[model samples]
Target: KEPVFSAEEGYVKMFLRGRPVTMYMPKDQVDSYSLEAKVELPTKRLKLEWVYGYRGRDCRNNLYLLPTGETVYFIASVVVLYNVEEQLQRHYAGHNDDVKCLAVHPDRITIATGQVAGTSKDGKQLPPHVRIWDSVTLNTLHVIGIGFFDRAVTCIAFSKSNGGTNLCAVDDSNDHVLSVWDWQKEEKLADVKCSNEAVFAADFHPTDTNIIVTCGKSHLYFWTLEGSSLNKKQGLFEKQEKPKFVLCVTFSENGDTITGDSSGNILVWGKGTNRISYAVQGAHEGGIFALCMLRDGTLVSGGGKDRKLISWSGNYQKLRKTEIPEQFGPIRTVAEGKGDVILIGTTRNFVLQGTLSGDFTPITQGHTDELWGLAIHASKSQFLTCGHDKHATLWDAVGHRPVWDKIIEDPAQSSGFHPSGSVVAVGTLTGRWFVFDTETKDLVTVHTDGNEQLSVMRYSPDGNFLAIGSHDNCIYIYGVSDNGRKYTRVGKCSGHSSFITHLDWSVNSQFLVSNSGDYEILYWVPSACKQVVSVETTRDIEWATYTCTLGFHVFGVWPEGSDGTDINAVCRAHEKKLLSTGDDFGKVHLFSYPCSQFRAPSHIYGGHSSHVTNVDFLCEDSHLISTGGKDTSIMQWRVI
Candidate 1:
């Protein structure tokens, strides 16, 4: 007998040999299997989720300063542009993985970005390549894919002599292959094997289309491009011993070559010369990671261990040494900006703009890892966000700056603000929860009862109690005292088969609603510290129309079907009329009050490129904030 399948609401119920069988399948898998079974299910309606702000940071060597004085940086899979004078920021989202390198065209209109290899949404492998985009509109123009190089692009450079027609890139593979492409022709010009050693840097000559320079562990190679054929020759750097690996290479205005090496030296070679002519020994206290030349012939070098940026005159005289901020970690790369300004990319996933005076300002956004939780302030125009980067930052919504940032000992799992907004609580993966004074930035309390990760925490609307859900499959309740600064354990709510995922309080603060990992919803009476039992007749529990309501009325019946979409987070508006839920599929679903059928939602939002870890309504109930799990972004959305 042929197996039959039928979809009810969001689940596909299968039957074999005239017997009913129950099996859980995801929406995508259900669609595929149903098609093979010759079954058709109604398509679900989807709506747009307009984004307001995105908060994230970029990695090393992922920053570029355009000729127009606009600073461009990569944050996760998105690109960000920040205007210093205007204090404006714009985001461009398209890449499937974190950007590894960036190159800007001299024409100031085209920008090239290289991304790490990753998988597509349909689970297909995607190769890394150079993506050319329009700078003004931030739209993708073309994708240049090089076959069989399955590694990240370490460095990319656009040819200055060819009207930005040619691009060169060095892959992070051991083959040490230098691939040059003709962007205008949409074809690769040459793939030259530079050396047996690993490649570090590659750049085009100042004004020669046929000349390109590449450096690696102990050798520097010069390539002459003759049509599609590439002729390679190794440069001779005469020294007592071959200087340490050349980490970076660049060109000066007077047609000279400069390279930074691991021996804390900067070597200068004459134009078209195959030997080093001059060397600056002990130029930096440690190995140099990057080097760049300004328009006025000043050379800037970023040090690895010294954490300093040193500037040298044209005649090899050390002009100045400026220490980078300690918070940004070691300086990984440097780029010359429009005027006296310079762009610095650091190992801490931050892009900083600095002048010669040593003052630096952050140009990128927030956390560099998965964001898990978000909480809005009760009165101020601010919110708190916690993430896998071990940081909990309070951000000013209007000003777009972090008011206060704190790094925990372990990665934070969830966070919430007190109703009075004077204190904040953060739960961690180390099985500890902390309470902090918002004004003083001091730890007020620590709870260590849960032996596993704490997943969710929330304060009651009336400021009387706090509820914490943990991976131990229990909910712990606490009573607030000392104006929300102190908390004491009241009771525990048990009966979950799996780990608890989310929790929310009722408007009156008498009841709490929570969801677990096994797709079970439970209603708890905080006053009695127990769950509400079901009866055949009418009940005294007051049912609301929000995301979580009274037991037995809408519990286990609202969503209609369970197709294994882990509802990670849920939130209700202040007015208790509308409800929102975020799931593992990077989708946000909005439902109307008293939702009894799973036919259609009020709306669906799809902005996050990864799992939606948390969602919450703002204080005024006018907007929503959703946190991305692997995308490392916190996006604000309008309620309407």
Candidate 2:
């Protein structure tokens, strides 16, 4: 039986990293499986080709799905595509240089990709000619020269009215050159270099044989096929508070001119009437990246702010909003599918899928968030997340949505899931610890009475013990019984002079490791496993006075200890090692457990320009994921 999606209104933006992740939804209201159900395609994950180093344009280049159905290609500074969906089919066409623009035919058989003339700082030269190819046959058709541009190619478009055959290329350097070519003759027909500041986008009038519109810095001009100027440059809408840079220009299905700008606004112009008929402000969080008009007057747009696809009516009414949660990055461009489905390209090097209706599903995978902590239940699909968000989010791992979301009202510093997947333990900012049941959604346990914010929480693999860290420089170990119905304080360990930040239990449940903000770690072994009544204070570790904030840690142990006691409370002289991160410096530290001695890390991961927010170790213990607040980027690292 197929899944049934109710008429309930919602949005789906499936992050595509494989096979053009296609999302198929009904164009109209229907209940049939194929009619109403949403089909999605994920893009294949490609390696990040080193493009121009931060040209600072803050815009996205064009992308295309290789016709072979195995690869999805993108032209940034260079052209490259990895096996995003594991099809094992990979290709690199452009030289290790940057390709500024792309234009693929609708027939899915040919692609016309363009790059600038010379090499940028990356030491990679741009391709001089437009490269056309049959992506399936793995054969190149032709490389036709379009006179060199002083800078990179800025944009390219294929004329849909010309049997998916005519090509239009534009460049930066304020050269509003519109070169129209016929692929059959492999010859440029008419080249009209207009007297405009810079040509960002150009498209032909859908039905008019000689009409075309091109965008400059802040104005748009209409030209004829004979290189004669038709209409004077049109000022942006009168209501525009500030003059804006027009980045994209396309025509509505009805031949109305649609343009998107750096100010995140859309302007619709009806030339015959000489009026700006419609406007949608803040259409995207950032500048509007890409825009496509569907046949039924539905407009699909993707861009900064939320990285999701938004649909609008022809009259500027918001039709629906779909969240492409999987991308976890900026949504850069969008393309329309045959039906109501829309494909989106994200900065994370993947595409996303959303539908006009029905439940949205992700068609691709391999994009993983840094797992700050992992709680494995007997059920493979059930897991707990307490690492990055500073809150505990419950998940049925196999499903796409979170089963439960709770705001750690007290600033959840850390969290863990029970082995049974029935309970979630949270360490909050008030130095208090609490446990809530996943099934009943009820608070099942509490400790410390909110005296200090607890930073981290962990549960023994056997589910018989719980460990909680506190800001008061203490660790509380609690005994669990009655299937987690009750918890009794069993032992207390105090050593660090600063707030305890994180705690972890060895898989064997015999050893535990704790890290503190004092830059010190402790290893502990319980003697009687009995409740301790009191504690004392130690020398305080003075926090450096600086104008900065710190995030969380993502360190862990390796190799299951026998008893599995092979773990340590801290990084000692010769025992197992521990992972630690300097919140302010954005540096990762690896230490030997128990002792204060530390070794230089294998390498310092330094992409983030500001304080690091959170870091996590993947299951394989071979890679790490790190997020930063200032940079607003989630980075992945593999240990060599």
- For model 2, what is the alpha-carbon lDDT of residue 77? 30
> Number of clashing pairs, model 2?
42
lDDT of 2 by residue, 1-640 (tens): 2122333321111211221111122323223322232222111111221111111123454644443443344432334343334534334444323456666776766767766565422235454557776666646677665455445556666677766677766666565566667665787767656546866677777776466677757767675666433344544466655436777777777778887877888878885543577778777766776777776878877666655577888777888876666534666666665456555666543444557553444333221222233333444444445533344555543332356656555555556666666777877666676788878768897776338866567667677887777778877888887666678878777766887765555545655555565544454543234322211111111111100111111112211111111111211111123342424333333332211111122333343323455554434433344443333333344433
Regions of model 2 farther than 4 Å from truth: 1-249, 253-256, 260-266, 270-290, 295-335, 343-374, 378-381, 387-391, 396-403, 440-442, 446-453, 499-511, 517-521, 526-640
- Model 2: lDDT equals 0.51
TM, every model: 0.82, 0.48
Clashing residue pairs in all predictions, respectively, total 1, 42
Looking at model 2, residue 76 earns an lDDT score of: 27
Specify the poorest-scoring 10-residue window by lDDT in model 1: 37-46
